[PDB]
Design a protein around this ligand. Structure first.
Ligand SMILES: CC(/C=C/C(=O)NO)=C\[C@@H](C)C(=O)c1ccc(N(C)C)cc1
Ligand SMILES: [K+]
Ligand SMILES: [K+]
Ligand SMILES: [Zn+2]
Length: 356
């Protein structure tokens, strides 16, 4: 009944080296450790990544070139995803880490496994996209697929989980549900409510297009409404949960207006299903707030109430000016007109009626 926490001093050090999120992995672990939460979780070292376990989703052709430019140095290797040194080994490390957590859920080692450094949901099978070179979420889903008949992927990141959805857009055995911001010109541009999948996978993709400024209460009523209908029609045997923290107030994305407590409500509702759940991180570019969020969420999984005051640790100075765990919503409008939100939920309710 004890959650597995994918951790390794070398692993965090590798994730620290990630270009867009310096030392973020350490900030998260350090803060989690500062609350002594790791003393209540089964700490598991991530396995070593092989080329063969990455090839279960990504093409050989893409994997060769990705490792090649990683040695020294098309395929989406530009813009947000520039070819940099050791990017293969970093991407593969996280890819393997998520697979390790998926493996633990299979062995019946636990009901919940955690890899906060994962959740890179934009990578296609043969294309790098949106800081994502390898798609660890997919790899984990494929691993869970060996034991569990139906997999449910819930993406609570600010951005649409296009990579994971595209990977399983033709199957009914893996259902993806993504709550994200949707507005012309906003990355990645896909994920409208009309996006329901293709082939036999039709109606087994769910996207919830949301506008700026949404807060906890409204977000949960939206999220729970959908998840109630999804769990009813799909009856999942396992869940992969992506909890990107770029939805939290104070994030440089300045889009949604969420607090960790809001996301926690969504997490509490999913955990109450008593299914094998794989918890993933993702976005979150306010490094301190991202640490605040996932630490609180770790406590939510553990069913513990955390002290409001941030304890002193290596990154204590980065938690000004209040040095508390809570996060206050920004005083800016919620751009979600109640009518449109209602129209979307009906569009989804209708789509879910097709699920047998
Ligand atoms: C890819 C992404 C988030 C992905 C994510 O979070 N996936 O989960 C965000 C991009 C669009 C972005 O917003 C951006 C902003 C500034 C910038 N420069 C100032 C260079 C470069 C990129
Ligand atoms: K999302
Ligand atoms: K699907
Ligand atoms: Zn994001």
């Amino acid at each position: 009944l004890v959650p597995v926490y994918i951790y390794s001093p070398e692993y965090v050090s590798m994730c620290d080296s990630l270009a867009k999120i310096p030392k973020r992995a350490s900030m998260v672990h350090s803060l989690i450790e500062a609350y002594a939460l790791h003393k209540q979780m089964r700490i598991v070292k991530p396995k070593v990544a092989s080329m063969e376990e990455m090839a279960t989703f990504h093409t050989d052709a893409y994997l060769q070139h990705l490792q090649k430019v990683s040695q020294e140095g098309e395929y989406g290797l530009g813009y947000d995803c520039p070819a940099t040194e050791g990017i293969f080994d970093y991407a593969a490390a996280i890819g393997e880490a998520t697979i390790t957590a998926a493996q633990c859920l299979i062995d019946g080692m636990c009901k919940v496994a955690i890899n906060w450094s994962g959740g890179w949901h934009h990578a296609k099978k043969d294309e790098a996209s949106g800081f994502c070179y390898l798609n660890d979420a997919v790899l984990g889903i494929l691993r869970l697929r060996r034991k569990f008949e139906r997999i449910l992927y819930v993406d609570l990141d600010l951005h649409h989980g296009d990579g994971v959805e595209d990977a399983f857009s033709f199957t009914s055995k893996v259902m993806t549900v993504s709550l994200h911001k949707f507005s012309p010109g906003f990355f990645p541009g896909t994920g409208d409510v009309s996006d329901v999948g293709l082939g036999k996978g039709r109606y087994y993709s769910v996207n919830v297009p949301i506008q700026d400024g949404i807060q906890d209460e409204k977000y949960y009523q939206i999220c729970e409404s959908v998840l109630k209908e999804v769990y009813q029609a799909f009856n999942p045997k396992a869940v992969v949960l992506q909890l990107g923290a770029d939805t939290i107030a104070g994030d440089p994305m300045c889009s949604f207006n969420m607090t960790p407590v809001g996301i926690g409500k969504c997490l509490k509702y999913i955990l109450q299903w008593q299914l094998a759940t794989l918890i993933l991180g993702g976005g979150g570019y306010n490094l301190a707030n991202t640490a605040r969020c996932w630490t609180y969420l770790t406590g939510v999984i553990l069913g513990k109430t955390l002290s409001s005051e941030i304890p002193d640790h290596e990154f204590f100075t980065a938690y000004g000016p209040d040095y508390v765990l809570e996060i206050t919503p920004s005083c800016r409008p919620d751009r979600n007109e109640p009518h449109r939100i209602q129209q979307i939920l009906n569009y989804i309710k209708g789509n879910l009626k097709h699920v047998v």
